[PDB]
Design a protein around this ligand. Structure first.
Ligand SMILES: Cc1cccc(CC(=O)Nc2cccnc2)c1
Length: 186
């Protein structure tokens, strides 16, 4: 099946806990895969305009590890619940992708999660201004604007709203799309 095929592909790229004990300032992100209308989508947030870091930017759910977290995956799931109301029974964490090093002292660990079809986002407005889906296939043929660095513009055909997706968030989206969608019979 589509979902079994995605999980099988993803597992081949799982680094697991290899980098998890290293003494960094630690953050995790959840790359949430949603199946709608027979296709996979990624779920993104738009960060509230009131956050100090990166107000109004498109981001995956996630945040800083805290002492309660059993592991880095727990961080991602805790933060996703806080930001968009995703409950743990509503997500299957399939793998841990390559971590992202930033600022010389920070390591961001991305986890891919399969999201239950009955999940409906409840954006927490103190953290998230919007939640939206993008089809995973978009990231194979994105609409690129050069601001010099590359920015994706995605327009939701449901409402005509355009989102800008940049940086680590854009990079990770492409990676997930390659992993899951490369070399597939039609
Ligand atoms: C791509 C990336 C880079 C750095 C940190 C994060 C996690 C995060 O802060 N997510 C978040 C927070 C609040 C609202 N929406 C999303 C993600």
């Amino acid at each position: 099946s589509m979902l079994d095929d995605a999980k099988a592909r993803l597992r081949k790229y799982d680094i697991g806990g290899k980098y998890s004990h290293l003494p960094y300032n630690k953050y995790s992100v959840l790359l949430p895969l949603v199946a709608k209308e027979g296709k996979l989508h990624l779920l993104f947030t738009v960060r509230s305009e009131k956050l100090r870091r990166a107000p109004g930017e498109v981001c995956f759910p996630g945040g800083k590890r805290d002492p309660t977290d059993m592991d880095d995956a727990a961080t991602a799931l805790r933060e996703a619940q806080e930001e968009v109301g995703l409950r743990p029974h509503q997500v299957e964490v399939v793998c841990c992708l390559v971590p992202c090093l930033i600022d010389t002292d920070t390591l961001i660990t991305p986890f891919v999660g399969l999201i239950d079809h009955n999940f409906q986002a409840q954006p927490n407005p103190a953290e998230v201004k919007d939640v939206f889906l993008v089809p995973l296939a978009y990231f194979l043929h994105p609409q690129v604007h050069d601001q010099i660095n590359h920015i994706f513009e995605y327009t939701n055909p449901e409402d005509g709203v355009t989102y800008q997706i940049k940086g680590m968030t854009a990079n990770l989206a492409v990676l997930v799309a390659f992993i899951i969608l490369e070399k597939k019979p039609t």
